[PDB]
Design a protein around this nucleic acid. Structure first.
Ligand SMILES: O=C(O)c1cn(C2CC2)c2cc(N3CCNCC3)c(F)cc2c1=O
Ligand SMILES: O=C(O)c1cn(C2CC2)c2cc(N3CCNCC3)c(F)cc2c1=O
Ligand SMILES: [Mg+2]
Ligand SMILES: [Mg+2]
Ligand SMILES: [Mg+2]
Ligand SMILES: [Mg+2]
Lengths: 245, 487, 487, 247
DNA sequence: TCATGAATGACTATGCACGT
DNA sequence: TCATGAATGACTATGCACGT
């Protein structure tokens, strides 16, 4: 068990449960989203750490400069573990680290910057399955009489719409289907019922299979060598759609 | 270089600041209970069509529209004012329907302009109801390009309902919010007893308005302060939160605070008791835990020691925290461009006067418009009775000016009416269509007679305020939130 | 909980970011030379009516309209993008007419959104010319509420004219601005010699586009770098400011810098020389004085010691400061959704192709509308030839549908034409108005004949690009600013 | 007497002039960073310095002295003027013989003026007595004639006059662009600020005069002091007659 | 001494590629 | 290391009146 703040980041909205095994840290993109998340959370087991701006690339930046970054220090300090050789999982203050970013490309980018920080400084967190990715909603179907439904893809939107209309439900063509363009547009209630409520949230657990292969891919995508990265994109961007087919 | 004395300059400049702040920034107009920034945001949103019958517009658009046409000030502070009007813990009856993160009763700030959307609420639509029927005076904006309303129709008593707080120069206002249903009863009485003097009116209105009704619920302790505010325009109203003592399985007792008095920051409240326990101010308390969430609302659990009495700790909280705090009432509002501290009967009466003004002006507008429509219709009917001629004349005319001038002479018609005959479509020459023009004339003349009747009978005018307000209250009126108890 | 491998996640997410940045943020479309934010700001302002035929709107209104309908991002950075497009030292041909403080070439920041006003420039109006005539593909916006243009008509070669600089992922662009009159000559040649191969075209276009023409004037030293950029898509162009040696009255020589190369901050330039002299790296310099003003423009006076040669000090300035600095040209633009480094002949050709597409599409739209208008006019003329009959039928009809159905039977008419006859006003039954309808039919049939001829002859199509562009250049073309000298 | 100007121990916001002679030097105390920015550009850098003030200045009449000296904006003014304050005041160290206060024409500009005049009268009174303090009068309108040079107006009256005369003279204005109305210094560019407030051959300055020191002392204390009642009764008593002070 | 709320924005850190 | 230019806002200080 470990003490919660009521010597940690000022931005950290810590949880109440002193058991790391039961605790969760939601690393959130943006102050707005983090603010509403802090309200809609379950304060007992869920803590919020809002990150502001693009995270520094630890692959490119010198080690001393990374340690001066306020956003990185917040993560390292909040997680409790050390980094690199001084890493100790025993001090992990949260056994569930959920990265929650916008569905847009900048959210995807921030995710890769965070995954790079974790893989390079605190790899065991990934190896032991403590790192997760929350999947935010993309649409909110607001039926005239029925309870609202959330969709996490264009397909699900079309499906839930079809089913509802077939069932005799109806929607306004004005208000209609609210489309989320980021976590910042959501309120406290919406975030709970889509990303933080443990009974409905869609989390993805980051697994690490081939460490050597991952090591290379991180260096290509995040490293200083542009040419290597340029050729990799032009080589593989053509086939991103077909990675899971 | 012209010389100017420092006394002349100081006096002229500071009074100019004081006066505009007093009348045109910090204090509410008595008729709609709005400050200039409020009135301008709402009209901007209204004019832009950001209404509840359409999806929320991006709030940046509402701010920008307010800035560009009506309110020559910063986008930052304007957004803050818009945000406030959307917070259910700030306004008893929100005027803005906010979509997104609009902050919390605590220190959690509202999201940035870019992230939130907003539109007018149904009640705000009643603030602006029939504003386009010359129901209120309009003046040119800050650069004369467009017109802005001097005051809103305000078809519900917004000043008393939502209250107002403002710091001016030399003075400040602090009016609490009230329950719409109670205010309506006061208005209904003021309408029925339109001849009652101030002495009787105050007694009647005070019996119906039992006291302020805060959005944050809570309690009102005592009746003196409330009475003072209504009779003097000044009064100290004692507020309290709601505390419910809970027992534990072991046998521990804990205090659960589920409500706080109006305008008490939840986070500052928890921080205060924490600092008053560590230093040694509120012994008997064992643990402070905020079990609040979006689903249970406010829930501050105060576990107390085994050697502690529940009420003793509660009484100490009343004394040393804002769990019990007073509302310094000061009924200051702008009346006819002058700041005035008002009794409750005056606040109601002045509002009722505004409503009667709104409806008489609306009636006048409708009556004028009806006569214009009737006037043109009379011209059309003359054309139909001599239709065989009218067509032949227009055809035989080399121009439309020759055709017009001929229409005036034959049928003995105005030029406006004659123009309408020319503007007539070949559709309207159909049998049933000719009949529609006839019936429409009969329809309007009945409508004109009705309108004339309203203006001639103060009884009907008061009846419309009552009946129309009644509909608003039946639709948008809600239960009381603040509970009134005795000493 | 679903499992996902870190390699799968990293690859998919980073490529999705890279591609969107490449195609939809950092790099210009080759056809209009615009990035998405530029295109969206300009269309927002255009659709909002913020045009040169009206007073400058508050720039907040342009941002809010861009933000709320097209560009789902922050108000802050969007304002910066709008502002840059209004700076004469940034854009060779500004697309925004800014009113207020839009900053300086130095460190003086632009005024806040609240203080500035803005509208489209006349040249920006040529970017959007006839966009409402289906000249470019439109797609749904970020929430499907409204349509936005994929590309602008761009009736002048904006990519080459204003240039573009952008940092993407895996690549970046840096295209310098050019003189519009020189670009037009290149386009005129490409139109005349439309069959010429790339070998001939590159030689022709390179002779007419003598080199970059920077808004900040200055000098271009050498010709190799320019040639490389046009033939390779990459080249290092050497820029220089303008220095004028003045001889004081007290036997004192001073260097006066009146111009600086493109994108050299005036204040950073002065700071650089000051810091390189307060240590010992630019000896010969005695004093640095910034005599610049709004009235004389840039004027940096460098007094040098008497035992110092002016030319030596100037060469020392060229070496150790940005008084001489290189422009790293990298002609990268998005072609058909793909990033591509282009030769100068390709950049021109691709633009000419876009203009021909625009005009063929415009012609098609006008021909369709002309046919529709003519179609209805044909119905009207039939009504006029049998006017006495037309009246009688409509009269005896119980509805307008009975009247319409009769018109079809009488004159053998469509439902569209018959409806148009019904909507006809008595206005048009006057003699001159009846003749106006006749002549109008003859006019459109003359227009249709013209339009059909355009589509059937590529020669005329190329002729329209030339003649219309020629008008644009004669009106909005200016002198060269950057002087080209040899080694 | 001569003093060094900053060029790559004075306020960072200060855009100092080049002239080392205070007698020929001028300090423009400007309301707002935007306005100060344009002023810094449109000025005559030889003799004119700019000190932008941000936000409403602290009331030295109400606030304790220690709190006033910790205020960054006050420190900037005191430091830039070079003179001390109160007893340690020394006119000989005055870095500018012309202290021009330039605020918006709006009501908030007037307020800042009274807060600045209060600072000067209470901390550095001799600057007022010796006529070193001035008030720049910004333009309210810019008449943009179609063919003729644009004219600036400093009142509604002058606007109507210049409009009538020009139309009578055969000139013409667009009814769209037309008469640009300034709502503050921040809306102006560098050129406009020069040709209306900073050009010594065209600027409209007002020199602050101090006649009755005792009467001024009282008026400052009433308007700016801690006593609200005194201020409230003064406003309700004299505001009705502000229009008729110069009739 | 702190809260109120309508007024008077600059500064702060990163990604990304490329050339000094 | 710094500039470029579109991307991902919170914090900072006063006026003003009044009550604890
Ligand atoms: O819209 C903008 O221009 C900005 C948006 N953000 C936020 C991230 C979304 C910024 C965040 C900054 N911080 C990053 C973290 N360390 C402190 C500074 C910043 F300095 C500037 C900006 C902007 O200009
Ligand atoms: O529009 C706004 O909300 C603000 C406008 N301004 C400027 C004056 C016009 C501010 C200035 C501040 N400073 C004042 C001088 N010392 C440093 C801080 C400030 F902290 C906040 C704001 C705003 O919120
Ligand atoms: Mg986002
Ligand atoms: Mg603010
Ligand atoms: Mg920014
Ligand atoms: Mg102002």
């Amino acid at each position: 068990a470990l003490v919660r703040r009521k010597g940690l980041p000022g931005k950290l909205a810590d949880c109440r449960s002193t058991d790391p095994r039961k605790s969760e840290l939601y690393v959130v993109e943006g102050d707005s989203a983090g603010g509403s998340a802090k309200s809609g959370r379950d304060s007992m087991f869920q803590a919020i750490l809002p990150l502001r701006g693009k995270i520094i690339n630890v692959e490119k930046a010198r080690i001393d400069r990374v340690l001066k970054n306020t956003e990185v220090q917040a993560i390292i300090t909040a997680l409790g573990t050390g980094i690199h050789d001084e890493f100790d999982i025993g001090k992990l203050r949260y056994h569930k680290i959920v990265l929650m970013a916008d569905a847009d490309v900048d959210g995807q980018h921030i995710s890769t910057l965070l995954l790079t920080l974790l893989f390079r400084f605190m790899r065991p967190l990934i190896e032991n399955g403590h790192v997760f990715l929350a999947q935010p909603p993309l649409y909110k179907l607001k039926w005239q009489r029925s309870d609202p439904e959330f969709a996490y893809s264009d397909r699900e939107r079309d499906g839930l719409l079809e089913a509802g209309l077939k069932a005799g439900k109806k929607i306004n063509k004005e208000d209609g289907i609210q489309r989320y363009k980021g976590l910042g547009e959501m309120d406290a209630k919406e975030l709970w019922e889509t990303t933080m409520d443990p009974s409905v949230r869609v989390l993805r657990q980051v697994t690490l299979d081939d460490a050597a292969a991952a090591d290379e891919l991180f260096s290509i995508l995040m490293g200083e060598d542009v040419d290597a990265r340029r050729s990799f994109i032009t080589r593989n961007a053509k086939d991103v759609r077909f990675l899971d087919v | 270089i012209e010389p100017v004395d420092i006394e002349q300059e100081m006096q002229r400049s500071y009074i100019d600041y004081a006066m505009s702040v007093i009348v045109g920034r910090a204090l509410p107009e008595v008729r709609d209970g709005l400050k200039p920034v409020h009135r301008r945001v709402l009209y901007a949103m209204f004019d832009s069509g950001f209404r509840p019958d359409r999806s929320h517009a991006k709030s940046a658009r509402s701010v920008a529209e307010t800035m560009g046409n009506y309110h020559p000030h910063g986008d930052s502070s304007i957004y803050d004012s818009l945000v406030r009007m959307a917070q259910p813990w700030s306004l008893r009856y929100p005027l803005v329907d906010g979509q997104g993160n609009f902050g919390s009763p605590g220190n959690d700030p509202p999201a940035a302009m870019r992230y939130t959307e907003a539109r007018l609420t149904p009640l705000a639509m009643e603030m602006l109801r029939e504003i386009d029927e010359e129901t209120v005076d309009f003046i040119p904006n800050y650069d004369g390009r467009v017109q802005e309303p001097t005051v809103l129709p305000s078809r519900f008593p917004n000043l008393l309902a939502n209250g107002s707080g403002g710091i001016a120069v030399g003075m400040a206002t602090n009016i609490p919010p009230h329950n719409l249903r109670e205010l309506a009863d006061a208005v209904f009485w003021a309408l029925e007893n339109h001849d009652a003097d101030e002495e009787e009116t105050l007694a009647a209105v005070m019996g119906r308005v039992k006291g302020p009704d805060f959005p944050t619920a809570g309690l009102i302790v005592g009746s003196q302060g409330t009475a003072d505010a209504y009779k003097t325009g000044r009064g100290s109203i004692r507020m309290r939160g709601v505390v419910e003592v809970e027992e534990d399985s072991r046998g521990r007792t804990s205090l659960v605070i589920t409500e706080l008095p109006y305008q008490v920051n939840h986070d500052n409240f928890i921080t205060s008791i924490a600092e008053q326990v560590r230093d040694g101010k509120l012994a008997g308390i064992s643990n402070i835990e905020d079990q609040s969430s979006d689903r249970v609302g406010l829930r501050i659990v105060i576990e107390i020691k085994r050697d502690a009495v529940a009420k003793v700790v509660i009484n100490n909280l009343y004394k040393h925290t804002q769990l019990q705090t007073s509302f310094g009432a000061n009924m200051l509002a702008i009346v006819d461009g002058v700041p005035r501290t008002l009794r409750l009967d005056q606040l109601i009466r002045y509002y009722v006067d505004h409503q009667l003004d709104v409806i008489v002006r609306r009636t006048t507008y409708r009556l004028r418009k009806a006569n214009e429509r009737a006037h043109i219709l009379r011209g059309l009917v003359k054309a139909l009775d001599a239709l065989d001629e009218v067509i032949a004349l227009i055809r035989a005319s080399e121009t439309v000016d020759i055709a017009r001038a001929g229409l005036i002479e034959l049928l003995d018609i105005d030029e406006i009416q004659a123009q309408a005959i020319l503007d007539m479509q070949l559709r309207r020459l159909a049998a049933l269509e000719r009949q529609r023009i006839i019936d429409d004339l009969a329809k309007i003349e009945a409508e004109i007679a009705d309108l004339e009747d309203i203006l001639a009978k103060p009884e009907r005018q008061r009846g419309i305020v009552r009946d129309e307000l009644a509909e608003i209250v039946d639709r948008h009126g809600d239960d009381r939130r603040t509970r009134i108890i005795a000493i």
